[PDB]
Design an enzyme around this catalytic site. Structure first.
Site, PDB file in Angstrom:
ATOM      1  N   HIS A  48       0.735  -1.186  -0.145  1.00  0.00           N
ATOM      2  CA  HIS A  48       0.027  -0.152   0.016  1.00  0.00           C
ATOM      3  C   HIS A  48       0.852   1.433   0.207  1.00  0.00           C
ATOM      4  CE1 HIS A  48      -3.511  -2.339   0.764  1.00  0.00           C
ATOM      5  NE2 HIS A  48      -2.741  -2.893   1.633  1.00  0.00           N
ATOM      6  N   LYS A  64      -3.760  -9.737  -7.675  1.00  0.00           N
ATOM      7  CA  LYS A  64      -4.866  -9.266  -6.393  1.00  0.00           C
ATOM      8  C   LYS A  64      -5.818  -8.471  -7.018  1.00  0.00           C
ATOM      9  CE  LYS A  64      -4.335  -7.423  -1.880  1.00  0.00           C
ATOM     10  NZ  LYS A  64      -3.683  -6.287  -1.148  1.00  0.00           N
ATOM     11  N   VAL A 107      -8.192  -6.454  -6.092  1.00  0.00           N
ATOM     12  CA  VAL A 107      -8.289  -5.019  -5.506  1.00  0.00           C
ATOM     13  C   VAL A 107      -7.036  -4.563  -4.764  1.00  0.00           C
ATOM     14  CG1 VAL A 107      -9.923  -3.536  -4.417  1.00  0.00           C
ATOM     15  CG2 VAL A 107     -10.756  -5.285  -5.773  1.00  0.00           C
ATOM     16  N   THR A 152      -5.235  -0.957  -2.796  1.00  0.00           N
ATOM     17  CA  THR A 152      -5.207   0.799  -2.822  1.00  0.00           C
ATOM     18  C   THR A 152      -3.703   1.041  -2.386  1.00  0.00           C
ATOM     19  OG1 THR A 152      -7.245   0.668  -1.922  1.00  0.00           O
ATOM     20  CG2 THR A 152      -6.017   2.560  -1.395  1.00  0.00           C
ATOM     21  N   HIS A 200      -2.865  -3.591   8.070  1.00  0.00           N
ATOM     22  CA  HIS A 200      -4.103  -4.123   7.069  1.00  0.00           C
ATOM     23  C   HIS A 200      -4.720  -2.824   6.461  1.00  0.00           C
ATOM     24  CE1 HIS A 200      -3.868  -8.473   7.794  1.00  0.00           C
ATOM     25  NE2 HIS A 200      -4.218  -8.408   9.052  1.00  0.00           N
ATOM     26  N   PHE A 201      -5.234  -2.646   5.335  1.00  0.00           N
ATOM     27  CA  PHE A 201      -5.693  -1.542   4.665  1.00  0.00           C
ATOM     28  C   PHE A 201      -7.226  -1.894   4.822  1.00  0.00           C
ATOM     29  CE2 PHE A 201      -5.692   2.516   2.755  1.00  0.00           C
ATOM     30  CZ  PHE A 201      -6.961   2.601   2.238  1.00  0.00           C
ATOM     31  N   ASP A 202      -8.018  -1.227   5.907  1.00  0.00           N
ATOM     32  CA  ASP A 202      -9.508  -1.686   6.031  1.00  0.00           C
ATOM     33  C   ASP A 202     -10.398  -1.194   4.832  1.00  0.00           C
ATOM     34  OD1 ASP A 202     -11.053  -3.417   7.804  1.00  0.00           O
ATOM     35  OD2 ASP A 202     -11.996  -1.681   7.698  1.00  0.00           O
TER      36      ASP A 202
END
Length: 124
Positions: free
Chosen positions: A12, A41, A43, A45, A119-121
């Site tokens: 990210h 992957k 998706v 961000t 983690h990117f939520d």
């Protein structure tokens, strides 16, 4: 093996640019960050802010994670981010990604010592 904090940075973090330059940014970055190797992957961000600014979100607004976990934090201000999403026509290994640039708050799950994003939520 990769630590959770190092995996979050690799997947990210993009502080070298202030925002997605062109529509090919996601195709470029998903490949050079190794996110299209065993599969693509679908998706992902990227955050265009300094690593210190993103790590600082772990001491900002404490909120529930999408899975019910309570170790997620929402940034107080908006951040430059790029959403990379596979198109309905992407076929591994020739993965095609749509790149959507935006300014939003990010929500990350934080863990360990030091307390850093793992983690990117989501983004809001």
């Amino acid at each position: 093996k990769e630590t959770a904090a190092a995996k979050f940075e690799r997947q990210h973090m993009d502080s070298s640019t202030s925002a997605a330059s062109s529509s090919n940014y996601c195709n470029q970055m998903m490949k050079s960050r190794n996110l299209t190797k065993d599969r693509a992957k679908p998706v992902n961000t990227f955050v265009h802010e300094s690593l210190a600014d993103v790590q600082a979100v772990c001491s900002q607004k404490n909120v529930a994670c999408k899975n019910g976990q309570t170790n997620c934090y929402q940034s107080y201000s908006t951040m430059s981010i790029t959403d990379c999403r596979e198109t309905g026509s992407s076929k591994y290994p020739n993965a095609a990604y749509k790149t959507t640039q935006a300014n939003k708050h990010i929500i990350v799950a934080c863990e360990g010592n030091p307390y850093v994003p793992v983690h990117f939520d989501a983004s809001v």
